[PDB]
Design a protein around this ligand. Sequence first.
Ligand SMILES: O=C(O)CNC(=O)C(=O)O
Ligand SMILES: [Mg+2]
Ligand code: NI
Ligand SMILES: [Zn+2]
Length: 331
Amino acid sequence: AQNPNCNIMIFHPTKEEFNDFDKYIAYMESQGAHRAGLAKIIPPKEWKARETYDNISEILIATPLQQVASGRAGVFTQYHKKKKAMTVGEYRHLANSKKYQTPPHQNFEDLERKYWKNRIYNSPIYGADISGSLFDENTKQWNLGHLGTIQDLLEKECGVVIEGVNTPYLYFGMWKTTFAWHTEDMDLYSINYLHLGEPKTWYVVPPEHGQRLERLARELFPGSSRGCGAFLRHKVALISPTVLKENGIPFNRITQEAGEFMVTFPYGYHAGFNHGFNCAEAINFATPRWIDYGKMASQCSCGEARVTFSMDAFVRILQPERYDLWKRGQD
Ligand SMILES: O=C(O)CNC(=O)C(=O)O
Ligand SMILES: [Mg+2]
Ligand code: NI
Ligand SMILES: [Zn+2]
């Protein structure tokens, strides 16, 4: 078995290998990359997402989210308080303000220490989940707005045509902005490209060990666990690396820098934080190997998780027994 210790793998495809997205994902899996839950892909030196980022300041962040924490430094939840709209130029100036800017630090490890020590005492503002793309339409390789759609994959694999669409999302971050422990909707893959700015640190649990993280989460967030049998679908809980190590949960960590792709694999729990002002783009995708994960994915039916239009068909076709209850949670 390849990569039996489930380490995060880093790939350096040539420009020739960068032509065929599906083929390269299958190659990475042939080498055991999925076992980690997360892989990094450094694009060939010839490749670019677009020519420059000089003209992005007028993009609107209609609903910036202030991420307010509750709990203790290593075990907390966050809720999202909606703020007034602002442009990306306004948000970048806010991220660089004395109140919100990255503190002085020696290296990524020092910054990671400062994040876990101090996150809960601040409420950073995240421009998350903005429909759109920063890939130039002329970028033909690994353009996250031109991928094969999940609906077309399900149709190719299973023969059933379904409604729904699959488009990318932009994330404008600042120091301490945080993504809570989660897997993707329907345990899909994700791909994330860091277009510009400061790094993003990731934590991940191997898919084979995901239920160990879920059991710890039920112990650490016991009221949330009674409320919902899949409460990590709410995307609000954080657990630090120190707490994971104390409880023997297998995980790995890696920092993504601007110009790099990350891929999360089906049922790979992940969490992390931004180092400073940045912009990322991400989208879900599927492969034939996903189908079995989609059929087994947990679902939130308590009403909290509320997701896209397109998840309907995935539940309806892959999880018909669950459909009725899940849809009640959506309505
Ligand atoms: O970058 C973020 O805030 C969160 N991204 C993801 O969870 C992802 O790409 O799957
Ligand atoms: Mg603009
Ligand atoms: Ni994700
Ligand atoms: Zn729920």
